[PDB]
């Protein structure tokens, strides 16, 4: 609701109190004293405050939804990055001017259809961010059209590797693939390091799938990122690519338990009393 | 050897042309609809020019 463009439009246009137009039932429960908490809080008002609320209740005042319907649209354009936040007042007066030149019963109905349409489109984008798959599956499958589907040797290792390659981009919503000129790439996160080169890695691994000092370090970076998404039976045991994928799974598991060992040794080296400079260097040389 | 004490007059002549001052934020031609003409676009704001 904090990211809802019509809840945010109600927090910027609608009053923060109980008027007798937007909240007719909640103020008639208070005029007629049938409220659970403090029923007699309306009898204790002056006639200027008490009779002016009765008149707005038995014959309520009409209002314009047009500034509220447009502000729900502007606050969804500013949320789906269609406009800048600095342009939020520029396009608000630009849209209010257009629905004033062309105001009709059709347009006010069409703004009522479009404020339900932008509630969906804000939520559809925020679902697509947390899923994180649609921008990557169409560009990884576009990569794999370029790569051949039949290697000469080790096709069993190759078709499970590229199936685990689809498992990184699916089971990590921040990861993405794209193109920049000839080659394609893979970032493990938005605005993060460890960017592998897919067109350079698969022109390096091609010719190494059945071999059983020769690897480019981005191919080894690819074999490090693909390692937690690869089973022991996904690739072979004797194959040099399969021998490394088991070796990189042990390196991740050792770096996962040297992380917990680091948090234990440095915790009991401060309380026991050591140099804080040398507690942090002798621990790494014990763990690396 | 008997040259008189002289003073230098400098000027330019630039015929056939119009002194173009483009209404762009870096004085360049990046398009016919300049970037300072798009900030005033959909603004509905009248400005005096002196």
Short mmCIF file of C-alpha atoms in Angstrom, two decimals:
data_model
loop_
_atom_site.label_atom_id
_atom_site.label_comp_id
_atom_site.label_asym_id
_atom_site.label_seq_id
_atom_site.Cartn_x
_atom_site.Cartn_y
_atom_site.Cartn_z
CA UNK A 1 0.00 0.00 0.00
CA UNK A 2 3.01 2.26 0.44
CA UNK A 3 3.83 1.54 -3.22
CA UNK A 4 0.22 1.86 -4.41
CA UNK A 5 -0.21 4.90 -6.71
CA UNK A 6 -3.80 5.51 -5.58
CA UNK A 7 -3.09 5.04 -1.88
CA UNK A 8 -0.25 7.52 -2.33
CA UNK A 9 -2.64 9.81 -4.22
CA UNK A 10 -5.04 9.66 -1.27
CA UNK A 11 -2.21 10.74 1.04
CA UNK A 12 -1.53 13.79 -1.13
CA UNK A 13 -5.00 15.00 -2.18
CA UNK A 14 -7.62 13.69 0.26
CA UNK A 15 -7.96 15.31 3.70
CA UNK A 16 -6.46 13.70 6.79
CA UNK A 17 -9.69 14.18 8.74
CA UNK A 18 -13.29 12.93 8.59
CA UNK A 19 -15.24 14.98 6.09
CA UNK A 20 -18.87 14.11 5.41
CA UNK A 21 -18.29 13.31 1.72
CA UNK A 22 -15.43 10.81 1.60
CA UNK A 23 -16.32 9.44 5.06
CA UNK A 24 -20.10 9.86 5.20
CA UNK A 25 -20.79 6.68 7.17
CA UNK A 26 -17.99 7.30 9.68
CA UNK A 27 -19.30 10.78 10.45
CA UNK A 28 -22.96 9.70 10.61
CA UNK A 29 -21.90 7.16 13.24
CA UNK A 30 -20.52 10.12 15.21
CA UNK A 31 -23.38 12.57 14.59
CA UNK A 32 -25.91 9.91 15.61
CA UNK A 33 -23.63 8.90 18.55
CA UNK A 34 -23.50 5.21 17.58
CA UNK A 35 -19.72 4.94 17.82
CA UNK A 36 -18.03 2.38 20.08
CA UNK A 37 -15.26 4.65 21.41
CA UNK A 38 -16.46 8.03 22.79
CA UNK A 39 -20.10 8.20 21.62
CA UNK A 40 -20.72 11.55 23.33
CA UNK A 41 -17.81 13.42 21.71
CA UNK A 42 -20.16 15.14 19.25
CA UNK A 43 -22.55 16.62 21.81
CA UNK A 44 -19.56 18.44 23.35
CA UNK A 45 -18.86 20.68 20.35
CA UNK A 46 -19.94 24.29 19.75
CA UNK A 47 -22.82 25.04 17.38
CA UNK A 48 -20.38 26.33 14.76
CA UNK A 49 -18.69 22.92 14.68
CA UNK A 50 -21.79 20.84 15.39
CA UNK A 51 -24.39 22.34 13.03
CA UNK A 52 -21.91 22.69 10.16
CA UNK A 53 -21.37 18.91 10.20
CA UNK A 54 -25.09 18.12 10.26
CA UNK A 55 -25.67 20.28 7.16
CA UNK A 56 -22.86 18.54 5.26
CA UNK A 57 -24.43 15.17 6.16
CA UNK A 58 -28.11 15.50 5.26
CA UNK A 59 -27.16 17.15 1.94
CA UNK A 60 -23.51 16.45 1.09
CA UNK A 61 -21.26 18.53 -1.14
CA UNK A 62 -20.10 17.34 -4.54
CA UNK A 63 -16.41 17.32 -5.45
CA UNK A 64 -13.99 16.95 -8.34
CA UNK A 65 -12.19 13.59 -8.62
CA UNK A 66 -10.17 14.91 -11.57
CA UNK A 67 -7.21 16.16 -9.55
CA UNK A 68 -7.24 12.85 -7.66
CA UNK A 69 -7.59 10.67 -10.77
CA UNK A 70 -4.72 12.43 -12.55
CA UNK A 71 -2.47 12.40 -9.47
CA UNK A 72 -2.82 8.62 -9.24
CA UNK A 73 -1.59 8.42 -12.84
CA UNK A 74 1.33 10.82 -12.29
CA UNK A 75 2.45 8.99 -9.16
CA UNK A 76 2.54 5.72 -11.12
CA UNK A 77 4.50 7.21 -14.01
CA UNK A 78 7.03 8.46 -11.45
CA UNK A 79 7.16 5.01 -9.84
CA UNK A 80 7.63 2.86 -12.96
CA UNK A 81 10.50 5.22 -13.96
CA UNK A 82 8.56 6.55 -16.97
CA UNK A 83 9.21 10.14 -15.86
CA UNK A 84 11.73 11.69 -13.53
CA UNK A 85 10.70 12.69 -9.99
CA UNK A 86 11.54 16.28 -10.98
CA UNK A 87 9.03 16.02 -13.85
CA UNK A 88 6.24 14.99 -11.46
CA UNK A 89 4.85 18.52 -11.28
CA UNK A 90 5.47 19.27 -14.94
CA UNK A 91 3.49 16.30 -16.27
CA UNK A 92 0.81 16.77 -13.60
CA UNK A 93 -0.08 20.22 -14.90
CA UNK A 94 0.36 18.90 -18.45
CA UNK A 95 -2.18 16.12 -17.84
CA UNK A 96 -4.58 18.36 -15.91
CA UNK A 97 -4.52 20.79 -18.82
CA UNK A 98 -5.35 18.02 -21.31
CA UNK A 99 -8.25 16.61 -19.27
CA UNK A 100 -9.52 20.19 -18.96
CA UNK A 101 -9.45 20.93 -22.69
CA UNK A 102 -11.03 17.57 -23.54
CA UNK A 103 -13.22 16.94 -20.50
CA UNK A 104 -16.16 14.63 -21.10
CA UNK A 105 -18.16 11.83 -19.59
CA UNK A 106 -16.04 9.49 -21.70
CA UNK A 107 -12.73 10.87 -20.41
CA UNK A 108 -13.63 10.80 -16.71
CA UNK A 109 -14.71 7.20 -17.17
CA UNK A 110 -11.50 6.56 -19.10
CA UNK A 111 -9.46 8.06 -16.25
CA UNK A 112 -11.34 5.76 -13.89
CA UNK A 113 -10.34 2.79 -16.04
CA UNK A 114 -6.74 4.01 -16.17
CA UNK A 115 -6.27 4.46 -12.41
CA UNK A 116 -7.16 0.79 -12.03
CA UNK A 117 -4.83 0.02 -14.91
CA UNK A 118 -1.86 1.72 -13.27
CA UNK A 119 -2.50 0.00 -9.94
CA UNK A 120 -1.99 -3.26 -11.83
CA UNK A 121 1.02 -2.00 -13.81
CA UNK A 122 2.83 -0.84 -10.67
CA UNK A 123 2.23 -4.20 -8.99
CA UNK A 124 3.09 -6.13 -12.17
CA UNK A 125 6.48 -4.41 -12.35
CA UNK A 126 7.20 -5.04 -8.67
CA UNK A 127 6.31 -8.70 -9.10
CA UNK A 128 8.60 -8.84 -12.14
CA UNK A 129 11.46 -7.31 -10.12
CA UNK A 130 11.28 -9.90 -7.34
CA UNK A 131 10.93 -12.70 -9.89
CA UNK A 132 13.73 -11.22 -12.02
CA UNK A 133 13.39 -13.60 -14.95
CA UNK A 134 11.72 -12.03 -18.00
CA UNK A 135 14.62 -9.81 -19.05
CA UNK A 136 17.12 -12.65 -18.63
CA UNK A 137 15.35 -15.69 -20.09
CA UNK A 138 14.72 -13.95 -23.42
CA UNK A 139 18.39 -12.94 -23.67
CA UNK A 140 19.97 -16.19 -22.47
CA UNK A 141 17.84 -18.24 -24.86
CA UNK A 142 18.88 -15.71 -27.51
CA UNK A 143 22.50 -16.50 -26.61
CA UNK A 144 21.99 -20.26 -26.82
CA UNK A 145 20.59 -19.93 -30.34
CA UNK A 146 24.07 -18.74 -31.35
CA UNK A 147 25.91 -21.56 -29.59
CA UNK A 148 25.64 -24.98 -31.27
CA UNK A 149 23.42 -27.58 -29.63
CA UNK A 150 25.72 -30.51 -30.55
CA UNK A 151 29.33 -30.51 -29.38
CA UNK A 152 31.44 -33.40 -30.79
CA UNK A 153 32.64 -34.81 -27.47
CA UNK A 154 30.91 -34.68 -24.10
CA UNK A 155 27.38 -33.76 -25.12
CA UNK A 156 26.13 -35.15 -21.80
CA UNK A 157 28.26 -32.59 -19.94
CA UNK A 158 27.27 -29.81 -22.34
CA UNK A 159 23.48 -30.11 -22.21
CA UNK A 160 23.46 -30.27 -18.41
CA UNK A 161 25.79 -27.28 -18.15
CA UNK A 162 23.52 -25.11 -20.29
CA UNK A 163 20.54 -26.36 -18.27
CA UNK A 164 22.35 -25.29 -15.10
CA UNK A 165 23.08 -22.04 -16.95
CA UNK A 166 19.32 -21.47 -17.12
CA UNK A 167 19.20 -22.27 -13.39
CA UNK A 168 21.37 -19.29 -12.39
CA UNK A 169 19.23 -16.73 -14.22
CA UNK A 170 16.02 -18.29 -12.86
CA UNK A 171 17.00 -18.85 -9.22
CA UNK A 172 18.69 -15.46 -8.85
CA UNK A 173 16.33 -12.51 -9.50
CA UNK A 174 19.13 -9.91 -9.51
CA UNK A 175 21.25 -11.70 -12.13
CA UNK A 176 20.87 -10.69 -15.76
CA UNK A 177 22.19 -11.33 -19.26
CA UNK A 178 22.34 -8.87 -22.14
CA UNK A 179 24.39 -8.00 -25.19
CA UNK A 180 27.01 -5.33 -25.81
CA UNK A 181 28.21 -5.56 -29.38
CA UNK A 182 29.18 -9.09 -30.39
CA UNK A 183 29.43 -10.81 -27.03
CA UNK A 184 26.95 -11.55 -24.27
CA UNK A 185 27.62 -11.22 -20.56
CA UNK A 186 26.24 -12.24 -17.17
CA UNK A 187 26.26 -10.04 -14.08
CA UNK A 188 25.58 -11.88 -10.84
CA UNK A 189 23.76 -8.83 -9.43
CA UNK A 190 22.58 -5.39 -10.41
CA UNK A 191 25.51 -2.91 -10.21
CA UNK A 192 27.86 -5.61 -9.02
CA UNK A 193 31.15 -7.16 -10.04
CA UNK A 194 31.84 -10.74 -11.29
CA UNK A 195 30.73 -10.19 -14.88
CA UNK A 196 31.56 -13.24 -17.02
CA UNK A 197 31.80 -13.14 -20.81
CA UNK A 198 29.47 -15.80 -22.24
CA UNK A 199 30.67 -15.56 -25.85
CA UNK A 200 34.30 -15.83 -24.75
CA UNK A 201 33.67 -18.62 -22.23
CA UNK A 202 31.72 -20.86 -24.61
CA UNK A 203 34.37 -20.41 -27.28
CA UNK A 204 36.84 -21.58 -24.62
CA UNK A 205 34.88 -24.48 -23.12
CA UNK A 206 34.08 -25.72 -26.65
CA UNK A 207 36.73 -28.38 -27.10
CA UNK A 208 37.08 -29.20 -23.39
CA UNK A 209 33.89 -31.16 -22.65
CA UNK A 210 35.46 -34.62 -22.95
CA UNK A 211 39.18 -34.20 -22.34
CA UNK A 212 39.48 -36.18 -19.05
CA UNK A 213 47.16 -23.63 -17.69
CA UNK A 214 44.62 -23.61 -20.50
CA UNK A 215 41.51 -21.82 -19.13
CA UNK A 216 40.79 -18.13 -19.46
CA UNK A 217 40.03 -16.69 -15.98
CA UNK A 218 36.50 -15.65 -16.98
CA UNK A 219 35.71 -19.26 -17.87
CA UNK A 220 36.94 -20.19 -14.39
CA UNK A 221 34.79 -17.34 -13.10
CA UNK A 222 31.87 -18.96 -14.92
CA UNK A 223 32.74 -22.34 -13.41
CA UNK A 224 32.73 -20.66 -9.99
CA UNK A 225 29.28 -19.09 -10.45
CA UNK A 226 27.72 -22.23 -11.98
CA UNK A 227 29.12 -24.46 -9.21
CA UNK A 228 26.27 -24.23 -6.60
CA UNK A 229 23.74 -24.97 -9.38
CA UNK A 230 25.48 -28.16 -10.56
CA UNK A 231 25.02 -31.61 -9.05
CA UNK A 232 27.68 -34.29 -8.81
CA UNK A 233 25.84 -36.22 -11.53
CA UNK A 234 25.25 -33.23 -13.80
CA UNK A 235 28.82 -33.50 -15.12
CA UNK A 236 31.38 -36.29 -15.09
CA UNK A 237 34.02 -37.15 -12.48
CA UNK A 238 37.06 -37.75 -14.70
CA UNK A 239 36.38 -34.93 -17.18
CA UNK A 240 38.59 -31.89 -16.56
CA UNK A 241 35.61 -29.55 -16.56
CA UNK A 242 33.74 -32.00 -14.35
CA UNK A 243 36.76 -32.41 -12.08
CA UNK A 244 36.88 -28.64 -11.56
CA UNK A 245 33.13 -28.23 -10.95
CA UNK A 246 33.45 -30.61 -8.00
CA UNK A 247 36.62 -28.76 -6.96
CA UNK A 248 34.83 -25.41 -7.09
CA UNK A 249 31.93 -26.80 -5.06
CA UNK A 250 34.42 -27.81 -2.36
CA UNK A 251 36.02 -24.36 -2.57
CA UNK A 252 32.66 -22.66 -1.98
CA UNK A 253 31.88 -25.00 0.91
CA UNK A 254 35.30 -24.43 2.45
CA UNK A 255 34.94 -20.66 2.04
CA UNK A 256 31.51 -21.00 3.69
CA UNK A 257 33.01 -22.73 6.74
CA UNK A 258 36.12 -20.53 6.80
CA UNK A 259 33.65 -17.65 7.02
CA UNK A 260 32.10 -19.12 10.16
CA UNK A 261 35.55 -20.06 11.50
CA UNK A 262 36.68 -16.44 11.01
CA UNK A 263 33.76 -15.16 13.11
CA UNK A 264 34.73 -17.57 15.93
CA UNK A 265 38.50 -17.02 16.06
CA UNK A 266 38.36 -13.21 15.97
CA UNK A 267 35.59 -13.18 18.59
CA UNK A 268 37.69 -15.15 21.10
CA UNK A 269 40.89 -13.25 20.24
CA UNK A 270 39.49 -9.91 21.38
CA UNK A 271 38.21 -11.16 24.74
CA UNK A 272 41.37 -13.17 25.43
CA UNK A 273 43.43 -10.05 24.69
CA UNK A 274 45.58 -9.69 21.59
CA UNK A 275 46.69 -7.07 19.11
CA UNK A 276 43.68 -6.18 16.99
CA UNK A 277 46.05 -5.60 14.06
CA UNK A 278 47.64 -9.05 14.34
CA UNK A 279 44.46 -10.94 15.27
CA UNK A 280 43.09 -10.12 11.81
CA UNK A 281 46.21 -11.10 9.87
CA UNK A 282 47.19 -14.31 11.66
CA UNK A 283 43.61 -15.54 11.27
CA UNK A 284 43.57 -15.11 7.48
CA UNK A 285 46.99 -16.73 7.08
CA UNK A 286 45.56 -19.62 9.11
CA UNK A 287 42.45 -19.72 6.89
CA UNK A 288 43.98 -18.94 3.49
CA UNK B 1 65.07 52.76 -40.09
CA UNK B 2 62.88 55.90 -39.94
CA UNK B 3 59.61 54.14 -39.15
CA UNK B 4 57.12 56.24 -37.22
CA UNK B 5 55.74 55.33 -33.80
CA UNK B 6 52.70 53.27 -34.70
CA UNK B 7 49.51 51.98 -33.09
CA UNK B 8 47.66 48.83 -34.13
CA UNK B 9 44.00 48.72 -35.17
CA UNK B 10 42.30 45.32 -35.20
CA UNK B 11 38.89 44.41 -36.62
CA UNK B 12 37.05 41.68 -38.49
CA UNK B 13 34.61 41.52 -41.39
CA UNK B 14 32.24 38.54 -41.47
CA UNK B 15 29.78 39.11 -44.32
CA UNK B 16 26.81 37.06 -45.62
CA UNK B 17 26.11 35.54 -42.20
CA UNK B 18 23.78 35.77 -39.22
CA UNK B 19 25.05 35.87 -35.66
CA UNK B 20 23.57 32.58 -34.50
CA UNK B 21 22.99 32.20 -30.76
CA UNK B 22 21.37 28.77 -30.30
CA UNK B 23 18.94 28.25 -27.44
CA UNK B 24 20.73 25.13 -26.27
CA UNK B 25 22.38 24.44 -22.95
CA UNK B 26 25.84 23.84 -24.49
CA UNK B 27 25.38 26.05 -27.62
CA UNK B 28 25.56 22.95 -29.84
CA UNK B 29 23.24 21.46 -32.45
CA UNK B 30 22.22 18.11 -31.00
CA UNK B 31 18.82 18.29 -32.71
CA UNK B 32 16.33 20.80 -34.10
CA UNK B 33 14.24 20.57 -30.91
CA UNK B 34 16.88 21.72 -28.43
CA UNK B 35 17.10 20.52 -24.82
CA UNK B 36 16.20 23.97 -23.46
CA UNK B 37 13.13 24.06 -25.70
CA UNK B 38 11.90 20.80 -24.21
CA UNK B 39 12.12 22.02 -20.62
CA UNK B 40 9.72 24.84 -21.56
CA UNK B 41 7.63 22.30 -23.47
CA UNK B 42 4.32 21.43 -21.74
CA UNK B 43 5.13 24.09 -19.14
CA UNK B 44 2.29 26.59 -19.83
CA UNK B 45 4.52 29.39 -18.53
CA UNK B 46 4.95 32.74 -20.28
CA UNK B 47 8.35 34.43 -19.98
CA UNK B 48 9.29 38.00 -20.80
CA UNK B 49 12.30 38.43 -23.07
CA UNK B 50 14.36 41.63 -22.84
#
